[PDB]
Design a protein around this ligand. Structure first.
Ligand code: ZN
Ligand code: ZN
Lengths: 306, 357, 1057
């Protein structure tokens, strides 16, 4: 119930202590005899019964594993757990948190119970406690800086993730942006989504021809197709019609061109809408939009027999 | 023996489940030799599909990557078994072998995520103590200043403080007899290996043995896009170093040294050499299509062998000496001349004999 | 939840135990009193109708009414007095007036019944004392059709009486004429009747309390039916199956089948393991009885199996029993004063519906026609208990909850609280703060609530008998005749509207905010808006269709006056129904939801009640509906022990989202025993009325208006923001209807992470993952995010494990373990069981389902004890994990307990450790480290490690070659045994230790022996190098190819040249 006064043990008068040992100090009498004076700091630290004073005395002296034997209230268990994490003792932290109903925390701590480097362990502990900046700094100073990326992407702080990826993982810059662009498609923001999709294009990997290279090539191709699809759709969303229509016509996916064809009427660019409606896979709705909005009978004359 | 029973009758699903459970049990119980054995066999089986099913290419690539990950885990656990035994047990040990094992673990522990129950503190303490004992004083103080930045058990800090304060004396000079040598660069590895156990001048991972982890006179390379494996040996049989220019493409100043550049050979190089000068390693992940790796043999006075169940490199005399332990290859427990039927009846006979007593 | 309103009409005399008679169909009840002796005739609800004094012609002596009986069809009573006289009490029939059908209300029927009973007549049967021989009439009994009467006197006489219903000028009178004069052995305790056909014949049984059960028929002879060896206690008869049960004073029961000539054949004989024993018919063919003990006993005649119905409360002793077959209810009365009502869904099929505490010695329990419970208690106390629902009301400011017959607690959320005790009973409560109004049938009293001084100032009463009424801020709306009138608090008539008799009489009236719903008795519904001056009706009456007879009991209207929730009852007995009815008047659509699928019966249904001067309420909050229904981890529990001490049939508060597409089940919430009832819904807070800490439910003061947050409103305790609250409402609605994309859109505008954890839980319950990643990333929980990412990486083909990981991260443990049981992943389930501090569950799961992860359980327990520094268990659990070769030696060496290990290995720990082979081999290796070669050899021999023994023996100076050769040859013989067994079942196994021996010969020039032992050992590489020695090259062949080592064959091909 205090945080500024040190605890004090009143030595009996006329004593000159000479040696502290096991929490007790031998003080020399004026006659030369040695008498043992016990410190109240080490009071009951060899007791394994549910006594609060013994737990606090062990807790203050960093007897954390020993103090795990003596716990009286769940709040004291919480204090011991947070201090054990604070002292970078994950092996004791798992044992304490097994009795605090946090199975996810225990399972994630069991993945890091074997690491010993203090920078990396410090970063993991800071991430667990919720200090993201300190965790990022510790991970960057450690031997595995890529963790500093993984915390950002899992928290989807895409700006910081892309900032880190510019020097850590040059090949991860597109993918991190791409998901960002998808998230941008949820927010109604498409202007920067164009840049994100454009930077999402991945250069073709080259190397020894095998199944692994072929699979990586196919994944790169699929990522490029998704990026160009998103870029064209966002271009149609904002008003960049002519640039997007070339990419729309180059592809062959019916659903993609169907989704792209809807927004062309709103920007009064009805020529590209007319071109896309007939190849959208349906002719009835295309002719309905023709006779109601476009009023271009020359194109509908070809669709009359169908 | 139920795992061997499953593997005898193919059945990849239950064999996978059993082998993964056994590997996890060995890792959680710190049975590092058992964990290495289970993980290398898991990597071996990860390309054993059912005959009725034709796997897709994406699944093939994913299982190839998982097999390589399991191979790396098995290598790390097998290396770490002896170091953990030395650190935590008062057991007899070799000094130079443990020193080279510690160097290999330091090299290959920073490359990727370290596997569970492989600690940096224990391996750093082992390397520091052995280097101090073997008078690798410069190496000892380097690994001690690295050891300052890890966590040690509660009954180790005082001793490590005393050791690192005492090691700051003595001349800073390491012995030239117990330093790793890179045959690719023809230079001694005076500095500690980086992440992945790579030469400072060439970035190529050295080909150590796998019982005492001493380097071997082999150089790793991969063929180009227009070569196979069968014809190479026969061409060499039918009938100064061509890679030196490639060497000039590695350690030359101004060249990109961010990532390791493999040596590349074509059909012109694979000719006019000695028959045994080339070692062909076919990584055994089962039926998965994986290109073979090749190794040039620099010297002939050292005998190197490959286990047919692992294709790892061992010193032939040391491999023969280790094979007498009653298991075979220390990593694989592989014994040649074994039939599945005879070994499958052996467990039944052993069950009969055990039930008798 | 229900409560028994109690009416206790006192009488100047003393009540009798068994002299209470209740009509079967008409709501009538009569009971006798002595000194002054009379009879009190009352209706079912308990109001006194009439009292009848001494029989006519009495010469100044008051005569005790000794027996009473009701006519089965006529509203006619027969009373046998104590002086031998017999009287018939008859009131003029209501239907004889031939008036209109305007008696649709209970109060008007009660009034006409009372005015008919006022002019009732007590007629004397002539010569009754002559037929009973001047003896007190002990018993009487009508026939099933009510045409014949049987009377039994105390002078051992039984007389048959004929009933003649003669018509008169204004009414129908009755004459009772004696026919026979039958002698009995003893005065008859009970007279029972047997019908000829199951559904006018003479078939009666007389039990006189002795050893005789005498039958009687039209033959005018008292021939016995069944006579047992003991004196009879009682007889219980079933008319439909003609099944008789005779019970004796010594806990013996016999079952007889009555024939046409009233003769019984025994088929079920049984024995049961101061209050006289009571026995009543629990069900057709099922008999319930109690012997004054704490347990009921239920007997099935069809199967013969007897079961015991247990009462959880000790010290209770049953005093009387009765049953109501229409709804299947038993009313257990106890000596203490506890009434327990049991309702049917043989002992396992019954359940305790409710418990009531009258608190006095219950002499007898009787049941009237309508289900009311008459009680004779305290010797001279009569109490009629009528079951009524808990009349609770909420307006938006304060809640008025009925808790007893008349006590009402009026409490607001601001802290104001007060108690109301009406002069009469309480039947209806209406609150519109500070206006309060109570309806007790005859009159409605309206008062105010003085919040500052916690006072209640009475304004006035209106003398109206309307079951439907509602007080508002502007005035009170009450029915009077076929019309409804809306006035002020000072009886100023504001408005009135009239309805035809074809449109019915309003029975339900519900007002809230500025909307009113009126429901008549014939399913006619009208919605209207109240104003400052007029009542604007919105449309005409609308019939409603319900896909015995359905009568709507309650109606609630939302704040828009657009959708109505409806509670209906079944049958004339008002049996509660398990259906909620939702009607959309604007779209004119009828939907319903059945509570029978959940094994629950509802009590009340409530719409959301917006607070006054709060117009920021959306329609999604208006459509929300709420209803009340009724059907190793040592530092864990202490966190919630404060709630567990705050704790000092199950309750289900269930909320729906009323949609025009139907009723969608939104959420469900269990309650606790101290939360008695739900008084209303005030978004986003439930308003459960609860008792205080360590309180008593029967105490009037011990009540608090508790407010618990909705289960969909976790983490929102400010209750101030509006946009966040309504967006969360929309998220919950779109989650319940399954439109998860719209839920994502609604929570996208929410900056509160509570909406994000709600969406994450929705993703758990809906199998969504990429949205759940955003959910985890928005709440700043990187632990669950990285757990989900690693789950996706490790299991790319299984979404169930990823869902379980997410649920575990969201503190959903039971859902996660159920999911992992579904997903086959038993290893991950064991890991989760360990991670929650339950090692016993992990042990059970390992030994039951997956018997391959028990070593990890043992090892994890050993590590747990090692971190706990309880090494005494850590060592034994490291041994149990079969890792005693690496860990127990480590746990001894690290703790500097090496001397104990030395003492253990020198040969609970001494019983197991010294004989363990792995420990012996470890100690041999350790001693070999200490250069103690001989001790190492001894321990290797004790551990049977041939390789190490041969190595040491061959490495010694001098080399002990003889014993090494002996061991090598023994192992060769074992290998040859294995190979010979293999061949008999149809190059043996090499012996590695032999290698060492060859090395010795390799240092002694014994080339042939070295080659032989190399080949026996399997040393092909050394075989080549020893074959190179003299001249032999064929031995180099057949060695390399056995190893399948390509390099060896290559090198030999090179060397042959
Ligand atoms: Zn190099
Ligand atoms: Zn091998």
């Amino acid at each position: 119930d205090s945080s500024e006064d040190n605890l004090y043990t009143p030595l009996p008068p006329g004593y000159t202590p000479v040696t502290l040992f096991r929490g007790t100090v031998v003080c020399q009498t004026p006659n030369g005899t040695l008498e043992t004076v016990p410190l109240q700091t080490h009071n009951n630290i060899f007791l394994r019964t549910p006594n609060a004073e013994a737990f606090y005395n062990n807790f203050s002296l960093n007897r954390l594993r020993w103090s795990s034997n003596n716990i009286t209230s769940p709040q004291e268990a919480e204090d011991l757990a947070v201090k054990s994490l604070h002292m970078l003792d994950v092996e004791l932290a798992i044992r304490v948190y097994r009795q605090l109903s946090q199975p996810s925390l225990v399972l994630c701590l069991e993945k890091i119970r074997h690491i010993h480097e203090k920078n990396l362990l410090l970063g993991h502990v800071s991430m667990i406690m919720g200090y993201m900046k300190d965790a990022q700094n510790f991970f960057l100073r450690s031997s595995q800086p890529l963790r500093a990326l993984e915390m950002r992407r899992d928290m989807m702080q895409w700006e910081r993730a892309l900032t880190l990826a510019e020097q850590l993982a040059p090949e991860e810059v597109p993918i991190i942006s791409r998901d960002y662009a998808q998230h941008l498609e949820y927010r109604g923001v498409y202007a920067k989504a164009l840049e994100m999709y454009q930077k999402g294009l991945r250069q073709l990997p080259t190397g020894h021809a095998s199944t692994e290279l072929s699979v990586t090539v196919q994944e790169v191709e699929r990522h490029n197709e998704q990026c160009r699809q998103g870029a064209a759709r966002s271009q149609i969303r904002i008003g960049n019609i002519a640039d997007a229509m070339k990419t729309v016509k180059e592809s062959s996916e019916v659903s993609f061109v169907k989704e792209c064809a809807k927004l062309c009427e709103e920007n009064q660019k009805h020529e590209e809408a007319a071109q896309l409606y007939e190849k959208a896979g349906d002719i009835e709705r295309a002719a309905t939009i023709y006779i109601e909005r476009c009023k271009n009978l020359k194109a509908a004359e070809r669709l009359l027999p169908f | 023996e139920a795992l061997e029973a499953f593997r005898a009758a193919k059945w990849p699903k239950e064999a996978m489940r059993l082998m993964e459970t056994l590997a996890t049990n060995s890792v959680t119980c710190r049975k590092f030799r058992d964990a290495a054995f289970y993980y290398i066999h898991l990597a071996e089986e990860y390309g054993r599909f059912e005959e009725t099913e034709k796997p897709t290419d994406v699944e093939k690539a994913a299982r190839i990557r998982r097999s390589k990950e399991c191979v790396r885990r098995a290598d790390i656990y097998y290396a770490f078994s002896g170091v953990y035994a030395h650190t935590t047990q008062p057991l007899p040990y070799n000094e130079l072998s443990l020193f080279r094992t510690a160097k290999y673990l330091f090299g290959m522990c920073a490359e990727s995520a370290i596997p569970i129950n492989v600690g940096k503190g224990a391996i750093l303490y082992t390397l520091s103590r052995i280097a101090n004992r073997l008078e690798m004083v410069r190496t000892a103080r380097a690994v001690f200043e690295k050891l300052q930045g890890v966590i040690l058990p509660v009954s180790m800090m005082e001793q490590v403080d005393i050791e690192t304060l005492l090691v700051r004396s003595k001349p800073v000079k390491d012995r030239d007899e117990l330093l790793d040598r890179c045959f690719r660069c023809n230079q001694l590895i005076a500095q500690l290996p980086m992440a992945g156990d790579r030469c400072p001048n060439c970035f190529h991972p050295c080909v150590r043995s796998f019982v005492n982890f001493e380097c071997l006179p082999l150089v790793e390379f991969v063929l180009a896009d227009e070569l196979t494996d069968e014809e190479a040996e026969r061409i060499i049989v039918s009938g100064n170093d061509p890679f030196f220019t490639q060497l000039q493409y590695v350690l030359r100043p101004g060249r990109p040294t961010a990532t390791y550049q493999p040596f590349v050979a074509s059909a012109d190089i694979l000719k006019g050499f000695r028959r045994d000068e080339v070692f062909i390693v076919r990584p055994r992940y089962g039926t998965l299509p994986v290109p073979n790796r090749y190794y040039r043999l620099m010297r002939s006075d050292v005998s190197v062998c490959l286990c047919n169940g692992c294709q790892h490199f061992f010193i032939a005399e040391d491999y023969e000496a280790e094979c007498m332990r009653g298991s075979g290859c220390p990593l694989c427990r592989y014994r040649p001349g074994k039939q599945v039927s005879r070994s499958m009846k052996q467990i039944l006979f052993d069950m009969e004999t055990a039930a008798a007593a | 939840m229900s409560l028994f309103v109690v009416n206790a009409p006192g009488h100047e005399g003393q009540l009798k135990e068994q002299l209470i008679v209740a009509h079967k169909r008409r709501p009538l009840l009569a009971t006798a009193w002595v000194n002054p002796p009379s009879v009190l005739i009352t209706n079912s609800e308990g109001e006194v109708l009439t009292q009848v004094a001494d029989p006519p012609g009495s010469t100044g002596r008051t005569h005790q009414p000794t027996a009473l009986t009701w006519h089965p069809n006529e509203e006619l009573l027969v009373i046998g007095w104590s002086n031998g006289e017999m009287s018939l009490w008859s009131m003029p029939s209501v239907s004889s007036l031939a008036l209109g059908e305007d008696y649709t209300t209970a109060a008007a029927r009660s009034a006409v019944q009372l005015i008919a009973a006022k002019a009732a007549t007590q007629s004397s049967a002539e010569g009754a004392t002559r037929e009973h021989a001047s003896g007190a009439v002990v018993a009487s009994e009508w026939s099933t059709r009510g045409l014949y009467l049987v009377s039994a006197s105390q002078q051992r006489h039984v007389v048959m009486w004929m009933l003649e219903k003669i018509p008169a000028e204004t009414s129908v009178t009755f004459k009772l004429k004696p026919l026979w004069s039958v002698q009995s052995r003893e005065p008859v305790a009970r007279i029972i009747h047997v019908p000829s056909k199951a559904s006018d014949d003479i078939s009666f049984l007389l039990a006189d309390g002795g050893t005789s059960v005498t039958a009687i028929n039209e033959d005018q002879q008292l021939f016995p039916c069944v006579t047992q060896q003991e004196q009879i206690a009682s007889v219980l008869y079933d008319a439909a199956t003609r099944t008789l049960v005779t019970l004796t004073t010594t806990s013996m029961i016999e079952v007889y089948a009555v024939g046409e000539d009233i003769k019984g054949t025994s088929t079920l004989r049984r024995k049961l393991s101061r209050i006289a024993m009571s026995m009543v018919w629990a069900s057709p063919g099922v008999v319930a009885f109690g012997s004054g003990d704490d347990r009921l006993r239920i007997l099935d005649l069809s199967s013969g199996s007897l079961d015991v119905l247990l009462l959880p409360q000790p010290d209770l002793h049953v005093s009387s029993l009765a049953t109501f077959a229409a709804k299947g209810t038993m009313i257990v009365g106890t000596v203490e004063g506890f009434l327990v009502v049991f309702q049917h869904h043989e002992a396992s099929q019954w359940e305790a519906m409710t418990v009531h505490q009258v608190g006095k010695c219950v002499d007898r329990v009787v049941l009237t026609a309508l289900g009311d419970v008459a009680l004779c208690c305290g010797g001279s106390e009569l109490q009629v208990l009528h079951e009524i629902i808990r009349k609770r009301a909420w307006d938006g400011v304060a809640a008025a909850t009925q808790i007893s017959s008349d006590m009402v607690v009026i409490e607001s959320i601001t802290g104001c609280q007060c108690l109301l005790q009406n002069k009469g009973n309480v039947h209806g409560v209406s609150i519109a703060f500070p206006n309060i109004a109570l309806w007790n049938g005859s009159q409605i009293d309206f008062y105010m609530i003085d919040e500052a001084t916690s006072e209640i100032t009475f304004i006035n009463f209106v003398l109206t008998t309307s079951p439907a009424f509602a007080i508002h801020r502007e005035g009170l709306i009450y029915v009077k005749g076929n019309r409804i009138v809306f006035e002020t608090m000072q009886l100023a008539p504001i408005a009135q509207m009239t309805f035809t008799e074809s449109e019915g009489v309003p029975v339900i009236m519900d007002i809230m905010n500025d909307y009113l719903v009126v429901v008549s008795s014939k399913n006619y519904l009208r919605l209207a808006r109240i104003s400052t001056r007029d009542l604007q009706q919105l449309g005409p009456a609308r019939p409603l269709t319900f896909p015995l007879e359905v009568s709507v009991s309650g109606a609630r209207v939302n704040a828009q006056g657009r959708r109505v929730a409806l509670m209906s009852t079944l049958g004339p007995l008002a049996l509660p129904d398990t259906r909620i009815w939702v009607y959309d008047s604007d779209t004119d659509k009828m939907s319903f939801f059945d509570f029978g699928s959940r094994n629950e019966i509802p009590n009340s249904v409530y719409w959301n009640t917006p607070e006054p001067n709060t117009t920021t309420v959306g329609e999604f909050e208006y459509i929300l509906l709420a209803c009340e229904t009724y059907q190793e981890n040592y530092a864990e529990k202490k966190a919630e022990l404060e709630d567990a001490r705050r704790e000092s049939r199950p309750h289900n508060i269930v909320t729906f989202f009323a949609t025009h597409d139907g009723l969608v089940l939104q959420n469900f919430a269990p309650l606790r025993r101290y939360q008695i009832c739900l008084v209303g819904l005030t978004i986003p807070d439930f308003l459960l009325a609860s008792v205080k800490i360590n309180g008593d439910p029967n105490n009037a003061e011990d009540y608090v208006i508790e407010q618990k947050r909705l289960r969909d409103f976790e983490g929102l305790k400010s209750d101030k923001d509006v946009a966040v609250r309504e967006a969360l409402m929309k998220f919950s609605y779109y989650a319940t209807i399954g439109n998860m994309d719209e839920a994502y859109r609604c929570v996208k505008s929410i900056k509160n992470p509570a909406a994000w954890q709600g969406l994450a839980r929705l993703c758990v319950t809906s199998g969504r993952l990429d949205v759940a990643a955003v959910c985890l990333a928005t709440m700043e929980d990187c632990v669950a995010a990285r757990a989900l990412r690693e789950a996706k990486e490790d299991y790319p083909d299984d979404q169930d494990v990823q869902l379980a990981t997410l649920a575990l991260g969201l503190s959903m443990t039971e859902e996660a373990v159920e999911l992992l049981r579904k997903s086959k992943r038993y290893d991950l389930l064991t890991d989760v069981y360990m991670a929650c501090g339950k090692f016993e569950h992990a042990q059970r799961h390992s030994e039951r389902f997956d018997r391959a992860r028990i070593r990890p359980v043992a090892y994890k327990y050993a590590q747990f004890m090692e971190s706990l520094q309880n090494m005494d268990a850590a060592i034994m659990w490291y041994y149990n994990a079969k890792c005693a070769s690496t860990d127990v030696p480590r746990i001894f060496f690290q703790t500097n307990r090496m001397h104990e290990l030395r003492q253990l290995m020198m040969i609970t720990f001494a019983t197991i450790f010294p004989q363990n082979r792995e420990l012996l081999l470890w100690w041999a290796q350790h001693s070999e480290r200490r250069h103690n070669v001989q001790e190492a050899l001894r321990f290797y021999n004790a551990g049977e490690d041939v390789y190490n023994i041969v190595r040491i023996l061959c490495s010694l100076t001098p080399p002990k070659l003889d014993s090494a050769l002996q061991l090598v040859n023994k192992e060769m013989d074992k290998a040859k045994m294995r190979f010979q067994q293999q061949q008999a079942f149809a190059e043996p196994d090499p012996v590695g230790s032999a290698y060492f021996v060859a090395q010795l010969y390799e240092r002694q020039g014994d080339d042939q022996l070295a080659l032989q032992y190399y080949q026996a050992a399997g040393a092909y590489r050394s075989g080549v190098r020893v074959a190179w020695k003299m001249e032999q090259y064929g031995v180099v062949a057949n060695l390399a190819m056995k190893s399948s080592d390509e390099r060896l064959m290559l090198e030999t091909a090179m060397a042959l040249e």
